[PDB]
Design a protein around this ligand. Structure first.
Ligand SMILES: *[C@@H]1O[C@H](CO)[C@@H](O[C@@H]2O[C@H](CO)[C@@H](O)[C@H](O)[C@H]2NC(C)=O)[C@H](O)[C@H]1NC(C)=O
Ligand SMILES: *[C@@H]1O[C@H](CO)[C@@H](O[C@@H]2O[C@H](CO)[C@@H](O)[C@H](O)[C@H]2NC(C)=O)[C@H](O)[C@H]1NC(C)=O
Ligand SMILES: *[C@@H]1O[C@H](CO)[C@@H](O[C@@H]2O[C@H](CO)[C@@H](O)[C@H](O)[C@H]2NC(C)=O)[C@H](O)[C@H]1NC(C)=O
Ligand SMILES: *[C@@H]1O[C@H](CO)[C@@H](O[C@@H]2O[C@H](CO)[C@@H](O)[C@H](O)[C@H]2NC(C)=O)[C@H](O)[C@H]1NC(C)=O
Ligand SMILES: CC(=O)N[C@@H]1[C@@H](O)[C@H](O)[C@@H](CO)O[C@H]1O
Ligand SMILES: *[C@@H]1O[C@H](CO)[C@@H](O)[C@H](O)[C@H]1NC(C)=O
Ligand SMILES: *[C@@H]1O[C@H](CO)[C@@H](O)[C@H](O)[C@H]1NC(C)=O
Ligand SMILES: *[C@@H]1O[C@H](CO)[C@@H](O)[C@H](O)[C@H]1NC(C)=O
Ligand SMILES: *[C@@H]1O[C@H](CO)[C@@H](O)[C@H](O)[C@H]1NC(C)=O
Ligand SMILES: *[C@@H]1O[C@H](CO)[C@@H](O)[C@H](O)[C@H]1NC(C)=O
Ligand SMILES: *[C@@H]1O[C@H](CO)[C@@H](O)[C@H](O)[C@H]1NC(C)=O
Lengths: 116, 311, 211
C-alpha cells in the first residue's frame, strides 16, 4: 500500500507563506491547481515549465523551484551558460590585463568538550 | 519509516512506541544528514565548470583522435564509447530509496564540458577566461613542464599522436576493474536485505507478529511481549543507522580525493608523484561511471637507455 | 575591502555548535521516558512498591538510560573523526597556503595562487586567498617555430604571435611582444620535421654592431 514521507517546499517564511508539497514516489491519483507528475513523485502547488534557471530549492532528479513573478515554480535546472571556444589550428588567445581577486574559505577545527 | 518497520500496520502499537521517546526522530535526522551530503559529494567532484563547453564540428586536433572519449552523437544518451562500457559492468516494509538530484545525463554534460575545455584551452579556463591555443602546442608546453625540451614534440608530432591513439585504444580491451563500484552497491544491498530479514525473529517472545499476540493473549501480558519485539527491532534500526554514518564518512573521503584529483589532474599539470598515474604526468581525461569517476591518466615514460661517462 | 561587505558564510561553524547542542538536549530529554516501567522516577518506585519488584523496575530504567549513554558516546567518536579530518586539512593549508606558495590547483583559492592571510574564527579558521586572474584576451595567429637560414628556431620561453603583418615573441601569461632575435631563441633541427613552421626574419645583433 503506497506511502512515503511528506515534505513541504517553502520559499522562506520571510518572503511568503505559500508552500508546495512533494509526495515521494506517490502517484498524483492516490494522494488523497498545479499538479505535475515527475519520476520523483507527485508535485503539487508549483507549475512545471520547460525553461531552465540555476538551482534554487533542490527538489530532486533534476527539478527545482523558487518564488517567481509572486509564485512558486519547478523546472529542469540548467547546468550553466553555454559557451563555444573559438578553436582553430593556428589561433591563440593571450591576456593583456589582469585583476587580483580575494576569496574566503572556512574550515572548522574543534568542538566543545563534554563530560557526563 | 520507523513506525512501519517496528510496529507495522498495527495501531495499538503506535501508542506503545510513543513511550520510548524520540528514537524515531533521531533516526530521521541522522539519515537526512547522509541524504543531503551524498548530493553535495557529486557536485563537488563534477560541478567544477561554469559554462558548458562544446568542441568544434570538425573534431580533428592535429591528428590526435579523441573519438573514444567524446560523446557519440548517434545515441539517445550521448555517452562516449568508453562510458557505455563503464555502465555495463555494474521496496520493502517501510524502506524506500530516494532518487539522486542529478540525473546521469546531467553528469555526462559536466564531463563533456571538462573534455571540451581541456582539449581546446588546456588549463586556462580553470583560472579565468578560456584562452584558445592549438592542441599540438598544448602538448609541447606539457613536455616542457616535465623538463623535456619542446622540439621533441614538434619534430616528432606524428609519432606521438599515432602512438597515443593506439595506447588509448588498448583501454577498451582491458575492460571488454570496477569492483570498487560494485562493492558500494553490494554493501548497501546487504544492509537492506539484513534489515528486512531481522523482522522474522522472536527475540525470546511467544511470537514474532504483533497481531498474533493479541489474537491469543490478554492485554496485560501482550504489552510485555510486544515491548520485547519493539526493543529488538529498535536495536536493529540503531545498528543500521550507525553503520550508514560510518560508511558515509568513507565515501565522503573518497569524493574529496576525487574532487581534488579533478582539480589537480584534469584542470592542471601536477608534479605530485603517483598522484596522477605512473610516470611523468602530461594530462588526464575524465569519464563518468555509475556512482563514480574514472580518470584516464596520460604519462611520459622514458625508454631505451644507454650508459655514458660523465663529469 | 569588499570582503567585509560580503559578511556584514559561517554556516559550517554554526553546524558544529548545533550538532552538539542537539545531542545534549536529546540526552537530557531521554530521562523522561518510562521504557515500559511503572514510572520514570527511581524514588517514586520505592514509595509505592516493595523491593522484590522495585529492583526489576529500576533495572529496566537503568538499561534504557545506559543505552542512551552508549548512543551518545558512539556518535561523539564518529563526529570527532570528522572534525579531526577537517583540522588536518586546515593545518595542511596553513603550511602550504600561508607559509609558502602552492602550485596545487584549487587548493588555495580560485585562480593562480599568490598569497594567503589567516584570520581566527570561533572554533575555526578563515583563509583570505589572494589569486592572480588574467583578463581581456585578444586572439592572434601562432606558429611553433620560425625558419631562418634553413634552420628551425624555437622559443626559449613564450609563444610566437602575429598581429596581422609582423611576428613577435611573447611571454605566455601577459601580452608583451619583443623582436625575435638569436638571444631569445635556440636552434634545433631543420625545417623539414616541424608541422606548421613559418618563414620570418630572426635578427642577429652582431652584424649591425659591426656595420
Ligand atoms: C588594465 O585594467 C585597469 C582597470 O582594471 C586599467 O586602469 C584604468 O584605466 C582607466 C583608463 O583606461 C583609468 O581611467 C582608470 O582610473 C584605471 N583604473 C585604475 C584602478 O587605475 C588599465 O589601464 C588597464 N590596462 C590596459 C593596458 O588597458
Ligand atoms: C578515430 O578512431 C576511430 C576508431 O577508434 C576511427 O573509426 C574507425 O575507423 C576505421 C577505419 O580506420 C573503420 O573501419 C571503423 O569502422 C571506424 N569506427 C567507427 C566506430 O566508425 C576514426 O576514423 C578515427 N578518426 C580519425 C579522424 O582518424
Ligand atoms: C603590427 O605591429 C607593427 C609594429 O607596431 C605595425 O607596423 C608598423 O611598423 C613600423 C616599423 O616597421 C612602425 O614605424 C609603425 O608605426 C607600425 N605601424 C603601426 C600602425 O603600429 C603594424 O601596423 C601592425 N599590424 C597591424 C595589422 O596592426
Ligand atoms: C620559406 O622559405 C624557404 C626558403 O626560401 C622556401 O623554400 C623554397 O621553397 C620553394 C618552393 O616554395 C623552392 O622552389 C625553393 O627551392 C626553396 N628554397 C630553398 C632554399 O630550399 C619555403 O618554400 C618558404 N615557405 C613558404 C610557406 O613560403
Ligand atoms: C567560431 C566562433 O566561435 N566564432 C565566434 C562567433 O560565433 C561569435 O559571434 C563572436 C562574438 O562573440 O566570437 C567569435
Ligand atoms: C528577512 O527579514 C530580516 C528581518 O527580520 C532582514 O534582516 C532580512 O534582510 C530579510 N531578508 C530578505 C531577503 O529580505
Ligand atoms: C498514475 O496512474 C495513472 C493511471 O491512473 C497513470 O496513467 C500514470 O502514469 C500514473 N503515474 C505514475 C507516475 O506512475
Ligand atoms: C516541454 O517540451 C516538451 C517537448 O520537449 C513538450 O512535449 C511539453 O509539452 C513542453 N511542456 C510545456 C509545459 O510546454
Ligand atoms: C650499462 O653498463 C652496465 C655495466 O656497467 C650494464 O649492466 C648495463 O646493462 C648497461 N646498460 C645498457 C643500456 O647497456
Ligand atoms: C577571437 O576570435 C573568435 C572567432 O574566431 C571569436 O569567437 C572570439 O570572441 C575572439 N576573441 C576576442 C577577444 O575577440
Ligand atoms: C587548418 O585547417 C584548414 C582547414 O580548416 C587548412 O586550410 C589549414 O591548412 C590548416 N592549417 C594547418 C597549419 O594545417
Amino acid at each position: 500500500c503506497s506511502f512515503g514521507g511528506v515534505s513541504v517546499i517553502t520559499p522562506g517564511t520571510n518572503t511568503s507563506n505559500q508552500v508546495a508539497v512533494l509526495y515521494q514516489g506517490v502517484n498524483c491519483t492516490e494522494v488523497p491547481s498545479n499538479v505535475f507528475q515527475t519520476r520523483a513523485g507527485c508535485l503539487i502547488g508549483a507549475e512545471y515549465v520547460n525553461n531552465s534557471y540555476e538551482c534554487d530549492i533542490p527538489i530532486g532528479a533534476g527539478i527545482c523551484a523558487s518564488y517567481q513573478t509572486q509564485s512558486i515554480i519547478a523546472y529542469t535546472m540548467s547546468l550553466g551558460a553555454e559557451n563555444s571556444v573559438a578553436y582553430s589550428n593556428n589561433s591563440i588567445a593571450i591576456p593583456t590585463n589582469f585583476t587580483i581577486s580575494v576569496t574566503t574559505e572556512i574550515l572548522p577545527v574543534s568542538m566543545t568538550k563534554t563530560s557526563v | 519509516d520507523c513506525t512501519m518497520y517496528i510496529c507495522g500496520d498495527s495501531t495499538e502499537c503506535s501508542n506503545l512506541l510513543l513511550q520510548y521517546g524520540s528514537f524515531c526522530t533521531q533516526l530521521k535526522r541522522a539519515l537526512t544528514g547522509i541524504a543531503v551530503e551524498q548530493d553535495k559529494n557529486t557536485q563537488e567532484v563534477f560541478a567544477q565548470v561554469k559554462q558548458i563547453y562544446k568542441t568544434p564540428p570538425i573534431k580533428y586536433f592535429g591528428g590526435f583522435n579523441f573519438s573514444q572519449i567524446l560523446p557519440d552523437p548517434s545515441k539517445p544518451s550521448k555517452r562516449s564509447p568508453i562510458e557505455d562500457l563503464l555502465f555495463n559492468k555494474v521496496k520493502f516494509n517501510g524502506l524506500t530509496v530516494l532518487p539522486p538530484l542529478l540525473t546521469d545525463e546531467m553528469i555526462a554534460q559536466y564531463t563533456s564540458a571538462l573534455l571540451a575545455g581541456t582539449i581546446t584551452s588546456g588549463w586556462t579556463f580553470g583560472a579565468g577566461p578560456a584562452l584558445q591555443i592549438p592542441f599540438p602546442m598544448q602538448m609541447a608546453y606539457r613536455f616542457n613542464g616535465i623538463g623535456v625540451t619542446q622540439n621533441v614534440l614538434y619534430e616528432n608530432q606524428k609519432l606521438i599522436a599515432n602512438q597515443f591513439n593506439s595506447a588509448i585504444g588498448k583501454i577498451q580491451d582491458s575492460l571488454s576493474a570496477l569492483g570498487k563500484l560494485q562493492d558500494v552497491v553490494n554493501h548497501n544491498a546487504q544492509a537492506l536485505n539484513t534489515l528486512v530479514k531481522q523482522l522474522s525473529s522472536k527475540f525470546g517472545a511467544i511470537s514474532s507478529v504483533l497481531n498474533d499476540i493479541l489474537s491469543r493473549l490478554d492485554p496485560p501480558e501482550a504489552e510485555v511481549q510486544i515491548d520485547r519485539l519493539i526493543t529488538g527491532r529498535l536495536q536493529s534500526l540503531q545498528t543500521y543507522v550507525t553503520q550508514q554514518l560510518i560508511r558515509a564518512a568513507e565515501i565522503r573521503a573518497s569524493a574529496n580525493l576525487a574532487a581534488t584529483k579533478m582539480s589537480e589532474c584534469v584542470l592542471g599539470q601536477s608534479k605530485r608523484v603517483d598522484f596522477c598515474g605512473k610516470g611523468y604526468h602530461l594530462m588526464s581525461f575524465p569519464q563518468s561511471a555509475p556512482h563514480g569517476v574514472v580518470f584516464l591518466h596520460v604519462t611520459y615514460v622514458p625508454a631505451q637507455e644507454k650508459n655514458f661517462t660523465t663529469a | 575591502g569588499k570582503i567585509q561587505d560580503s559578511l556584514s558564510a559561517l554556516g559550517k561553524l554554526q553546524d558544529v555548535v548545533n550538532h552538539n547542542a542537539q545531542a545534549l538536549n536529546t540526552l537530557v530529554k531521554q530521562l523522561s521516558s518510562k521504557f515500559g516501567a511503572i514510572s520514570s522516577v527511581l524514588n517514586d518506585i520505592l514509595s509505592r512498591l516493595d523491593p522484590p519488584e522495585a529492583e526489576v523496575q529500576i533495572d529496566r530504567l537503568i538499561t534504557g538510560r545506559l543505552q542512551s549513554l552508549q548512543t551518545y558516546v558512539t556518535q561523539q567518536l564518529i563526529r570527532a573523526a570528522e572534525i579531526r579530518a577537517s583540522a588536518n586539512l586546515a593545518a595542511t593549508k596553513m603550511s602550504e597556503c600561508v607559509l609558502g606558495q602552492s602550485k596545487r590547483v584549487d587548493f588555495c583559492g580560485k585562480g593562480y595562487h599568490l598569497m594567503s592571510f589567516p584570520q581566527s574564527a570561533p572554533h575555526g579558521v578563515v583563509f583570505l586567498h589572494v589569486t592572480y586572474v588574467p583578463a581581456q584576451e585578444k586572439n592572434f595567429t601562432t606558429a611553433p617555430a620560425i625558419c631562418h637560414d634553413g634552420k628551425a628556431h624555437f622559443p626559449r620561453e613564450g609563444v610566437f604571435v602575429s598581429n596581422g603583418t609582423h611576428w613577435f615573441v611573447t611571454q605566455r601569461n601577459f601580452y608583451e611582444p619583443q623582436i625575435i632575435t638569436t638571444d631569445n631563441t635556440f636552434v634545433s633541427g631543420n625545417c623539414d620535421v616541424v608541422i606548421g613552421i613559418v618563414n620570418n626574419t630572426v635578427y642577429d645583433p652582431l652584424q649591425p654592431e659591426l656595420d
